[PDB]
Amino acid sequence: DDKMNLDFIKSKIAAVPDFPKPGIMFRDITPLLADPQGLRKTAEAMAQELKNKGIQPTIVAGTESRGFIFGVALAEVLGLGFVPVRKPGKLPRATYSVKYDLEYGSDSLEIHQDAFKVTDEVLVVDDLLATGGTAKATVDLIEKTQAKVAGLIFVMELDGLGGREVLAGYNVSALIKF
Amino acid sequence: DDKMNLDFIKSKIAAVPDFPKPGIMFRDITPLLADPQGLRKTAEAMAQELKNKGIQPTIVAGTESRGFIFGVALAEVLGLGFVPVRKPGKLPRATYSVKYDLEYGSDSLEIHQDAFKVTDEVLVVDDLLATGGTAKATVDLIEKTQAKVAGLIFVMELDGLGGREVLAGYNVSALIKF
Numbered sequence A, B: 001d002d003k004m005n006l007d008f009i010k011s012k013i014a015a016v017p018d019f020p021k022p023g024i025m026f027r028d029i030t031p032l033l034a035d036p037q038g039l040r041k042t043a044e045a046m047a048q049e050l051k052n053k054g055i056q057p058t059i060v061a062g063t064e065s066r067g068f069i070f071g072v073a074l075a076e077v078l079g080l081g082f083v084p085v086r087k088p089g090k091l092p093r094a095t096y097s098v099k100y101d102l103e104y105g106s107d108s109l110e111i112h113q114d115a116f117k118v119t120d121e122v123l124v125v126d127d128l129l130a131t132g133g134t135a136k137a138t139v140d141l142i143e144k145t146q147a148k149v150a151g152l153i154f155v156m157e158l159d160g161l162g163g164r165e166v167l168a169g170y171n172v173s174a175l176i177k178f
């Protein structure tokens, strides 16, 4: 019933060649989302993995936009609140900001300054761990509020692309390796 | 019992002057999301309003990105899957498209062509009914599939801005009127 759930989740993630550009494999979550059980099982497998490692966050954060999807799903299952981590110009009130390099060049992520109390133990959720650059940025953002990162969890991890190594010092979990 | 829940939701939505540009009052759901019970109560109060109306959807659709957030929480509560309705170029496989007007120009939205089955009755979920443009675009996208629209539900509605009228012939629910 733990292994069976993973194989279920795997089976709803379609591999799509050559998106968004030629020479890259894309992992399409949409059949997982559309299945009445897909987000529930995903969120429950994540909660099971956090329980197994003794990670007890007080609040969840997710990046725009698939991080919103898995983050809200898991936050409901854990009974925690959710904080969106956003692209510049979307948050209305005072922000912190972190600039980071990635594939297409560079960009920024933002949170509200009051997203987190000094007391919070923040779980980052995202769909996919690759180079770990967005996750690092997200970590740097959180720490500007004096909250601490309780850990990071991903639906998927791409083998040996360096992400876990960049996030060394933070607890990192992924349900599926590709 | 249930007007307590509406009061709690209202109490967590910030009103923010001159955002994104002077003249307009931005409604900010981030304290609602942060609160451990925000999303739970928002989704339960959407479920309650649907059930008052005898509306029983088979799948939930929501627009990027705040539609993802309320859409996913509601879909979890109702035991249904979820379909993201996305900005152009995000979805990896064949899409349908609908160009919609806004203030200064047009934009568009997309869904996978295989998102809904012929048997589906889609609930559209979003944060805010203002003019109805994105809601109506979304209704047109769903109706390019074989599926039908069961209804639309919003957290908030800007009174007499014309959204309901544009959504003539579709059932529309909103928790809070501004």
Ligand SMILES: [Cl-]
Binding pocket: A029, A030, A066, B084, B091
């Ligand atoms: Cl997606």
Ligand SMILES: [Cl-]
Binding pocket: A064, A065, A066, A067
């Ligand atoms: Cl995304």
Ligand SMILES: [Cl-]
Binding pocket: A084, A090, A091, B030, B066
């Ligand atoms: Cl937001």
Ligand SMILES: [Cl-]
Binding pocket: B064, B065, B066, B067
């Ligand atoms: Cl948004």
Ligand SMILES: [Mg+2]
Binding pocket: A091, A092, A093, A094, A095
């Ligand atoms: Mg600002």
